[PDB]
Design a binder for this molecule. Structure first.
Ligand SMILES: [Mg+2]
Ligand SMILES: [Mg+2]
Ligand SMILES: [Mg+2]
Ligand SMILES: [Mg+2]
Ligand SMILES: [Mg+2]
Ligand SMILES: [Mg+2]
Ligand SMILES: [Mg+2]
Ligand SMILES: [Mg+2]
Ligand SMILES: [Mg+2]
Ligand SMILES: [Mg+2]
Lengths: 244, 242, 242, 244, 196, 248, 102, 232, 241
């Protein structure tokens, strides 16, 4: 029969690891780094594009930053295409919660379901895990600003600041040294970029090779705003950090 | 390498099972060719009957698919018949649903898309055959369309298939460079058959009795095959020009 | 490697043969059939001294007139137990009567070879056979007191006495000696202890071995530790005697 | 690569399907069986090897009938042959239920053809271990077909398969040449007996029982019938004297 | 139908719900509670066809309990009521519809308000200061329209209710065997010891 | 019996997905196609590769209309392209036009194609598609656009690019020439040059296929009377129109 | 409307003696005002010393008797040729009937 | 050596199905059983195998209808599937057509049933052989089933360990026994003799011998225990 | 359609996919449970091998199943979630049909069964998870502590531990838990739990979490400050004498 051709994607190694997950994580280590940092008054998401030609159209590009919802966003690292599948089912989970309960979906609840999905690919049906890691940034009113991460194993964890993809050992260390809790949002913006300057394998860090986003309850009214920075806004912020 | 056993990519980006299926097409050692007249289309195929115990009348690689479409197959008979039946079914279903006779080129397209699927899905094997469809289409005139195990298809001015395909093809390429047109300039199909047999004897360097060939002809609103006798008529006509 | 339903050149099912190696490794279990009843005993084999050994249930009730003991991967047995209970109860719903022990066992054994990859339904299948054997003990009016050994090969055998698990090899040569027609129930209880005490690594006591019997009059009962302790002692005394 | 011969739908690099080729060996290895077209009917015959004297003579019938007018006989794996007829019978019943007319022999050949070819398409199934000789009388006269594990079939004047196939084929080639005008049914029966006796001489070591049937327009009325009693005897006689 | 009333005063929500259960010709019981607590600060009362009413409530209950455990959190009364409405709205186009009407009274700890929701068997939901199901509205809305003030105390609420139950005892053909009354407030849910 | 319910594309220990890589190799071996974006239009172009001179190359469309405002071209295995075109046209109707009564905008249709491609990268019993597509279109709220879709399922927008054999060379050549004030006629001019490097056979309107997403063509609508329906923005060029331009 | 039922009856009578039992029925089978048979027996021996009769609509009665006998035969196969006690037979028949409760 | 024995859908290059051949090997390792017939009766005789001195003797004979039944040698659960499948076909023939099912047809059905498992991925073949006897509208019958699918009609035979003995004896005894018409006991004694050219180091007891008989005016019935002392 | 048999027997009678599953547990963080006269306490270690960890939102290691039963685990975290969801659902369903909450034994038995099923069905691998389940039965004060493991085997324990270095903390307890005189206070029982973790965690209440289950659904997690007292105070006893 065809069980000769089946590389069994759901098994344990003799150490009790899941081959395909480990391998997908390996894959992810070569993706653009992404970063999330949470302040008491907002969240920052920053990410590095895969070295992009001069002819590539950077206005309409959205390789790493995606809106799930009016209040939750993700930064991706890994296979774009795999991610867009996941993003989309999540956008729908949010809508279903909203429609059942007439309340926007709490961030963890969403994160958990999406992680539960990845977990299933890891335990049944012989398909290959999704080669994606996610940073989720969101606001709800049970826990305010929140930051989470998930990977191909289905595991998720919450963070004050975190990175995924390339050079995370390096980047984690550097945040660990400079993060403080009272941190304001414009502090976090600055810290996010410092970290990618140091971390990037490319010799400079320039506007055309970044995606950037914030979630502010700022300013006057209690409502929450999500901003995905355009190329010109990112160039300005880079001058203003004297990284350029 | 199991990238050799099923339809997945080799590291060079190749589907060996597709390549090996092409190879199987030549197992019968039969050559075939098709050409176009002013208002007909003709196919010619060798016919070999090695065994003395076979009923010769049952030995054929040419099929009447529909009222209007003929198909000739290069390759082993079981796969030929499987593709024949399939196309018969498709052509009839098309008519029922859309209210007109299925066109050659569209049927070719469909049959090609079926082949394409065996190249992408693993539990299906490609068929070891090359189908040449002919008709006189009501929109397009005399037409020839060819399909292979890659899932590829194209229309032809004329064409030839088999081991000695190259000889035959170059012979025809030459003829049309001279003649400057894309068809045999002939009113009667009886002479387009004569042309076809002639231009084939010269390319294969070999002579034919009436039992060495099969012929099929597509006129406007019928595709039919010839009997040894209507063939014999043609071989006599050719001989009158020594 | 090679599918789970394959035969070895000796005509044996690999997965089933290997199943039996799991069973040789499990705690020990012994059954003895008499005219006054049937006794069932087990080694508990706590894995650490913090383990509350009450919680180790290797002897279970199936109906009032039928009990069960197990050695092997004991998790595997929870669903064989479920099926057997369901079969006994179900029988009695349809027939206003107790199921025959024989029939109940045959029912359990029918599960054993339903494993595979197969397809698709009618039914789906276990991926592997069960890694557990059972002694099934009961009374019915047709054949009286009865001990069966039900293995994952699907076969089952009646025994006047039987032992399964890590002890079985010697434990059985010992049963061959000791057993005769005329054993009283009490003789049989002590025997089972005698043989467990021998083959257990641990020093036997009321906390690491457990006893049960089934009699027509009182059905199947597990014995408490106090009742068992007093039979351990009872045996200690007869050991003083030669 | 190697192992092009382990899986059933696979093409070797020379263009071939080795599992079908191996099924042909299972056939070459079976007992001898044949078909002879006479000029209003057809005749089937088959060597039944006698393992032991404990077989009941007359009673292990290897020729099978389909509908009322078609005979099949096969060399190779017998249970596969029976399986194939069971299919053939469904096909003929379906055809007749819908179209009223009993199935035409060519139509019926292609039915088996397609079903057999179908078992060379997938690795999860195994090709048929038989060649099948069959035919009968339709509204256009007599037809004799033979069908290989690959689903190749053609029409024959005569046909043979199994161990004896070469002595039989040579012998049939005779008949064709030394009776160009056609052969009467009753003569074709006797010839068939002869030919089986001639082809038996590959393994004289074993004793054998002969079985013959015919479907003839004049003699059996276009229905398929076994030859037995006096006519069977008379054809066994003709076979004895043709040996000496 | 049976009697299902509710009123949202200033600091709590009061639910009044008839005690009788009758099967045709006999009154089978005179002490039946037509409520389930869905979470500590959320109470649902209900009425409609036999079997359906309870099955539906106990199913809603178990779902909200499941939610609470899973999230270690108590859904807002608004959310519970939207959940319930959606379930009823699925029921109507189903093979056999749940014929059940409910009132949901909750205290919303996050906004420190009481809230009353009325939902009929079609999934028609509405937030109200006072409500009822079936014919119960016909007798009592006159009085509530007149007397209701949003700043009423619980005691005032209970008086206004006493008057409503009297009007029902007077003008309504059925003997519904009194009511059980519960209060949902910031400290949770309790039952009024006696409606004498 | 489809036994093959498991992925045939899996992660190697290095993190590669071999079958996606190998598909990309098939693409690289394919004939050069390219696309370039002007301000008032987009052009996509490729080389017809006549397999016999007896074949009629007009009967091979390498450039395909997907919707009246959207076209495609490819490098790699043409059969895989043919069935992706069928699939894409259908999904534009079922998952967009049948709902909103208008054709999907370029990027959304690209997602749908991308998605199909991804599925063949993860589902049971299939290999990935061995093509890269360039898709060009226009829609009222995004204007003109150009996307590349890869076997992995990944896509990305471009001002201009190229795929297949000569693509590194051609991408270099396009960087020299592309500005953001390019008018459509000028981009065609450039497309023709950039193609001409990558080809040593005959180079003219019979061996070159080329389409534009431009102004609306009411002469190609088929009916008159609804002032709000203007023609398709998509148009293949004629053998003639091409040679005409091979003067400049 | 096709009406799937009919009435052939039929009268049957069963009496329990103290060490014996009888079961009796007329042998006449009717439809409306017609006789179909003057001898069409309706009491059957089903063989674990059990006699059965199913009076009413003849076709449904025949189906039931068939099914029960088959049940007896399968009880044997399945329970080591055990004899089927009358009370077990009765339970078994409740199940056959209730099987068609609707 | 032998990649070709991994499943049933794989032919060897010589043309063999190894998995089937390995299933036939389970039969030879089974305990011996013998079948034979006159024109009026058919008889099974079977040697049952116990595990210990403490254990039952596994039954080898199964009744399939009043007029038919069989003995097994090899994988017992498998016989249980097949004999059950047969009971159903015997039953279906009675209920639907009011007809005792012919032994020839039961033969054909078992063949077709076994053949399924030998052409399909995932199915192992059956690991049991069977002797079936029946008395039907054309008198006494005996069949031998193999899990390859081949069924063959015989006057006598045996299957299982050392059965070559019992078979050679039957070949020589033939004309004696073929005429034991209207005599049940003689035919049994002639079966029991046969089964003896097959015992190595043990002889027939009351506990290990089972016998069945069927025929004209005698329904398929099985003797064991006291009932068989008669002939031992 | 994917039903490949992944948990099968090898020739020595072992089932490697299940044994490999235990390897995942051995790599998981240590968890431990000990029972009092009338509390049960569950303690688990954290990795502070990273410390920008948002501890209020990040999944806890101890989970409520019902208001009277908790469950903790070692091994694959993603896998744990699925056992917990199934359990929570079973607990609510049990109330619905029997009108009583689950016994701890029942709930354990349920979860073990799920685990077992996944060692015997096509298309799936076993759970990389081992569990401790604790609580009190309804209207009952005798505390319960149960353990499950990937094979589906379960049993109860006076006290027990699982995860990396479990065999070290098992030693410790194997000789510090008196079955005749189990910890009579909560405070006492919490102390014995922290003690046993301190053999292996070796930082402090940064890395420890405790949860105390008492009768009548009285469940509570400690905050690091109050846990700290138990740590700081364990020091004064080991050193001075
Ligand atoms: Mg999904
Ligand atoms: Mg929802
Ligand atoms: Mg039941
Ligand atoms: Mg709806
Ligand atoms: Mg309505
Ligand atoms: Mg037009
Ligand atoms: Mg009526
Ligand atoms: Mg041997
Ligand atoms: Mg529930
Ligand atoms: Mg499952």
């Amino acid at each position: 029969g065809s069980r000769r051709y089946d590389s069994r994607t759901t098994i344990f190694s003799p150490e009790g690891r899941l081959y395909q997950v480990e391998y997908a994580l390996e894959s992810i280590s070569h993706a653009g780094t992404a970063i999330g940092i949470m302040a008491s008054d907002g969240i920052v998401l920053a990410a590095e594009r895969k070295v992009t030609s001069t002819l590539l159209e950077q206005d309409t590009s959205t390789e790493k930053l995606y809106k799930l919802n009016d209040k939750i966003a993700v930064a991706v690292a890994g296979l774009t295409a795999d991610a867009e599948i996941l993003i989309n089912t999540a956008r729908i989970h949010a809508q279903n919660y909203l429609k059942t309960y007439n309340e926007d979906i709490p961030v963890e609840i969403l994160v958990r379901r999406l992680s539960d999905i990845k977990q299933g690919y890891t335990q049944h049906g012989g398909l290959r895990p999704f080669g994606v890691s996610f940073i989720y940034a969101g606001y709800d009113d049970r826990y305010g600003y929140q930051l989470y991460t998930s990977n191909p194993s289905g595991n998720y964890t919450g963070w004050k600041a975190i990175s995924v993809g390339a050079n995370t050992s390096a980047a984690q260390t550097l945040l660990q040294m400079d993060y403080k809790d009272d941190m304001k949002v414009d502090d976090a913006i600055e810290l996010a970029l410092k970290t990618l300057s140091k971390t990037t394998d490319s010799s400079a860090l320039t506007y055309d090779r970044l995606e950037f986003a914030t979630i502010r309850k700022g300013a006057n009214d209690g409502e929450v705003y999500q901003k995905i920075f355009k190329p010109q806004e990112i160039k300005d912020i880079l001058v203003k950090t004297g990284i350029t | 390498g199991y990238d050799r056993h099923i339809t997945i990519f080799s590291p060079e980006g190749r589907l060996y099972q597709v390549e090996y299926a092409f190879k199987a097409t030549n197992q019968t050692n039969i050559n075939s060719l098709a050409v176009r007249g002013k208002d007909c289309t003709v196919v010619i195929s060798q016919k070999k009957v090695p065994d003395k115990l076979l009923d010769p009348t049952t030995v054929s690689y040419i099929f009447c698919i529909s009222r209007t479409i003929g198909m000739v197959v290069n390759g082993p008979i079981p796969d030929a018949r499987n593709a024949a039946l399939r196309a018969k079914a498709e052509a009839a279903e098309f008519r029922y649903k859309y209210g007109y006779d299925m066109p050659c080129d569209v049927l070719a397209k469909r049959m090609a898309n079926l082949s394409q699927i065996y190249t992408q899905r693993a539990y299906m094997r490609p068929l070891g055959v090359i189908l040449t469809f002919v008709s006189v289409d009501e929109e397009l005139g005399p037409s020839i369309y060819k399909t292979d195990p890659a899932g590829y298809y194209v229309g032809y001015k004329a064409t030839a298939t088999g081991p000695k395909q190259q000889e035959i093809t170059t012979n025809l390429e030459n003829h049309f460079k001279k003649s400057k047109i894309d068809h045999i300039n002939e009113e009667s199909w009886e002479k387009v058959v004569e042309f076809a047999i002639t231009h084939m004897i010269d390319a294969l360097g070999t002579e034919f009795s009436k039992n060495d060939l099969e012929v099929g002809v597509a006129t406007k609103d019928k595709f039919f095959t010839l009997s040894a006798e209507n063939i014999e008529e043609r071989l006599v006509a050719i001989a009158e020009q020594d | 490697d090679r599918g789970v339903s394959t035969f070895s050149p000796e005509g044996r099912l690999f997965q089933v043969e290997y199943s039996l190696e799991a069973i040789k490794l499990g705690s020990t279990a012994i059954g003895i059939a008499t005219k006054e009843g049937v006794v069932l005993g087990v080694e508990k084999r706590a894995t650490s001294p913090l383990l509350e050994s009450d919680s180790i249930e290797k002897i279970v009730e199936i109906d009032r007139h039928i009990g069960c003991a197990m050695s092997g991967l004991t998790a595997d047995a929870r669903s064989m137990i479920e099926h057997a209970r369901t079969a006994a109860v179900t029988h009695n719903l349809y027939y206003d009567e107790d199921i025959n022990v024989e029939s109940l066992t045959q029912s359990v054994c029918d599960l054993a070879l339903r494993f595979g990859e197969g397809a698709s339904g009618e039914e789906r299948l276990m991926s592997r056979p069960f890694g557990v054997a059972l002694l099934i003990a009961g009374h019915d009016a047709d054949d009286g007191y009865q001990l069966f050994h039900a293995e994952p090969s699907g076969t089952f055998y009646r025994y006047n006495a039987k032992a399964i698990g890590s002890g079985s090899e010697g434990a059985q040569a010992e049963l061959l000696n000791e057993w005769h027609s005329s054993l009283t129930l009490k003789e049989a209880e002590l025997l089972v202890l005698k043989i467990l005490k021998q083959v257990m690594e641990e020093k036997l006591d009321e906390n690491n071995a457990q006893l049960s019997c089934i009699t027509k009059q009182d059905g199947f009962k597990i014995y408490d530790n106090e009742k068992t302790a007093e039979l351990i002692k009872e045996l200690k005394e007869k050991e003083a005697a030669e | 690569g190697t192992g092009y011969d382990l899986s059933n739908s696979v093409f070797s690099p020379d263009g071939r399907n080795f599992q079908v080729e191996y099924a042909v060996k299972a056939v070459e290895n079976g007992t001898t069986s044949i078909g002879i077209k006479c000029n209003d009917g057809v005749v089937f015959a088959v060597e039944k090897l006698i393992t032991s004297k404990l077989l009941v003579p007359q009673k292990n019938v290897k020729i099978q009938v389909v509908d009322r007018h078609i005979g099949c006989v096969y060399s190779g794996l017998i249970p596969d042959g029976r399986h194939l007829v069971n299919r053939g019978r469904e096909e003929a019943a379906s055809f007749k239920k819908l179209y009223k007319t009993p199935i035409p022999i060519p139509a019926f050949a292609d039915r088996l053809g397609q079903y057999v070819q179908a078992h060379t398409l997938y690795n999860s199934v195994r090709p048929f271990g038989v060649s099948t000789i069959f035919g009968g009388v339709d509204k256009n006269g007599a037809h004799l077909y033979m069908l290989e594990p690959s689903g190749s079939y053609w029409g024959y004047k005569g046909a043979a398969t199994g161990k004896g196939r070469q002595s039989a084929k040579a012998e049939l080639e005779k008949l064709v040449d030394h009776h160009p005008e056609g052969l009467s049914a009753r003569e074709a029966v006797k010839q068939a007996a002869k030919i089986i006796y001639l082809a038996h001489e590959d393994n004289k070591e074993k004793d054998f029982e002969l079985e013959i049937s015919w479907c003839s327009l004049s003699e059996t009325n276009g229905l398929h019938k076994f030859v037995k009693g006096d006519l069977l005897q008379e054809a066994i006689d003709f076979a004895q004297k043709e040996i000496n | 139908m049976d009697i299902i009333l509710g009123i949202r005063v200033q600091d709590s929500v009061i639910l009044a719900s008839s005690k009788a259960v009758t099967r045709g010709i006999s009154v089978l019981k005179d002490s039946d509670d037509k409520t389930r607590q869905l979470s500590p600060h959320t109470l649902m009362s209900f009425a409609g066809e036999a079997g359906d009413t309870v099955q539906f409530a106990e199913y809603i209950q178990a779902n909200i309990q499941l939610y609470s455990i899973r999230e270690d959190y108590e859904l807002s009364p608004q959310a519970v009521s939207s959940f319930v409405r959606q379930e009823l709205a699925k029921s109507i186009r189903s093979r056999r519809p749940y014929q059940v009407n409910v009132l949901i009274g909750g205290y919303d700890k996050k906004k420190n308000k009481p809230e009353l929701y009325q939902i009929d068997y079609l999934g028609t939901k509405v937030e109200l200061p006072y409500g009822a199901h079936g014919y119960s509205g016909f007798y009592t809305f006159s009085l509530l329209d007149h007397h209701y003030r949003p700043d009423m105390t619980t005691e005032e609420g209970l008086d206004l209710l006493k008057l409503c139950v009297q009007e029902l005892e007077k003008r309504m053909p059925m003997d519904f065997k009194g009511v059980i009354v519960k209060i949902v407030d910031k400290d949770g849910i309790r039952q009024v010891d006696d409606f004498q | 019996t489809d036994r093959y319910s498991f992925s045939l594309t899996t992660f190697s220990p290095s993190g590669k997905l071999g079958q996606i890589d190998y598909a990309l190799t098939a693409v690289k071996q394919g004939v050069t196609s390219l696309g370039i974006k002007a301000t008032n239009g987009v052009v996509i172009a490729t080389e017809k590769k006549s397999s016999s001179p007896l074949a009629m190359s007009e009967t091979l469309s390498k450039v395909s209309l997907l919707t009246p405002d959207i076209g495609a071209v490819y490098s790699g295995m043409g059969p895989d392209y043919r069935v992706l075109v069928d699939k894409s046209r259908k999904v534009a109707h079922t998952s967009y036009k049948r709902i909103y009564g208008e054709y999907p905008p370029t990027k959304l249709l690209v997602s749908e194609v991308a998605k199909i491609m991804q599925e063949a990268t993860q589902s049971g019993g299939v290999r990935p598609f061995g093509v890269s597509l360039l898709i060009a279109g226009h829609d009222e709220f995004n204007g003109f656009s150009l996307y590349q879709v890869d076997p992995s399922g990944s896509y990305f927008p471009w001002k201009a690019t190229a795929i297949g054999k000569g693509s590194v060379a051609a991408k270099t050549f396009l960087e020299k020439r592309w500005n953001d004030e390019l008018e459509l006629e000028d981009a065609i001019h450039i497309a023709l040059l950039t193609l001409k490097e990558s080809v040593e056979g005959e180079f003219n309107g019979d061996t070159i296929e080329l389409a534009i997403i431009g102004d609306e063509n009411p002469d190609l609508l088929g009916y008159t009377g609804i002032p709000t329906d203007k023609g398709p923005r998509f148009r293949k060029l004629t053998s003639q129109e091409i040679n005409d331009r091979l003067e400049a | 409307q096709f009406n799937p039922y009919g009435d052939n009856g039929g009268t049957i009578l069963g009496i329990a003696g103290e060490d014996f039992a009888v079961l009796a029925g007329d042998t006449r089978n009717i439809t409306d005002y017609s006789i179909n048979s003057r001898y069409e027996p309706k009491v059957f021996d089903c063989g674990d010393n059990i006699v059965m009769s199913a009076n009413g609509f003849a076709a449904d009665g025949d189906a039931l008797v068939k099914r029960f006998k088959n049940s007896v035969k399968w009880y044997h196969f399945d329970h080591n040729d055990k004899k089927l006690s009358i009370n077990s037979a009765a339970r078994n028949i409740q199940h056959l009937l209730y099987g068609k409760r609707f | 050596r032998n990649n070709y024995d991994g499943d049933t859908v794989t032919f060897s290059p010589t043309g063999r199905l190894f998995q089937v051949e390995y299933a036939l090997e389970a039969i030879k390792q089974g305990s011996v059983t013998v079948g034979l017939r006159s024109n009026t009766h058919a008889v099974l005789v079977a040697l049952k195998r116990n595990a210990d001195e403490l254990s039952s003797y596994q039954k080898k004979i199964i009744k399939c209808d009043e007029h038919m039944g069989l003995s097994l040698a090899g994988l017992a659960p498998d016989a249980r599937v097949l004999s059950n499948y047969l009971r159903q076909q015997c039953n279906y023939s009675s209920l639907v057509f009011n007809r005792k099912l012919a032994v020839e047809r039961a033969g054909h059905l078992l063949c077709d049933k076994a053949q399924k498992n030998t052409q399909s991925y995932g199915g192992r073949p059956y690991g049991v052989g069977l002797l079936i006897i029946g008395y039907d509208k054309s008198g006494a019958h005996l069949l031998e089933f193999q899990p390859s699918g081949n069924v063959t009609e015989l006057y006598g035979t045996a299957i299982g360990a050392r059965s070559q003995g019992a078979k050679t004896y039957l070949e020589r005894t033939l004309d004696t026994f073929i005429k034991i018409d209207g005599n049940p006991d003689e035919l049994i004694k002639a079966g029991v003799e046969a089964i003896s050219q097959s015992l190595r180091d043990e002889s027939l007891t009351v506990d290990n011998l089972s016998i069945a008989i069927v025929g004209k005016d005698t329904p398929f019935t099985i003797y064991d225990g006291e009932a068989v002392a008669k002939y031992i | 359609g994917y039903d490949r048999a992944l948990s099968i027997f090898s020739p020595d009678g072992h089932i490697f996919q299940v044994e490999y599953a235990l390897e995942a547990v051995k790599r998981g963080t240590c968890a431990v449970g000990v029972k009092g006269k009338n509390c049960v306490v569950l303690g688990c270690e954290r990795r502070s091998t990273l410390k920008l960890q948002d501890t209020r939102i990040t999944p806890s290691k101890v989970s409520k199943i019902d208001s009277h039963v908790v469950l903790s685990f070692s091994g694959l975290n993603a896998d744990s979630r699925i056992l917990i969801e199934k359990a929570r659902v079973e607990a609510q369903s049990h109330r619905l049909t029997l009108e009583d909450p689950v016994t701890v034994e029942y709930l354990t038995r349920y979860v073990a069964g799920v685990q077992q099923r996944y060692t015997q069905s096509g298309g799936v691998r076993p759970f990389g998870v081992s569990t401790l389940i604790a609580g009190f039965d309804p209207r009952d004060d005798e505390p319960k502590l149960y353990q499950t493991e990937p094979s589906g085997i379960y049993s109860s324990w006076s006290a027990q531990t699982i995860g990396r270095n479990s065999k070290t903390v098992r030693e410790f307890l194997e000789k510090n838990y008196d079955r005749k005189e189990p910890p009579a206070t909560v405070e006492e029982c919490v102390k014995l739990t922290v003690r046993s973790l301190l053999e292996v965690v070796q930082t402090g209440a940064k890395n420890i979490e405790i949860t105390v289950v008492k009768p009548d659904s009285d469940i509570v997690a400690l905050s690091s400050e109050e846990i700290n007292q138990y740590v700081t105070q364990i020091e004064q006893e080991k050193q001075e004498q």
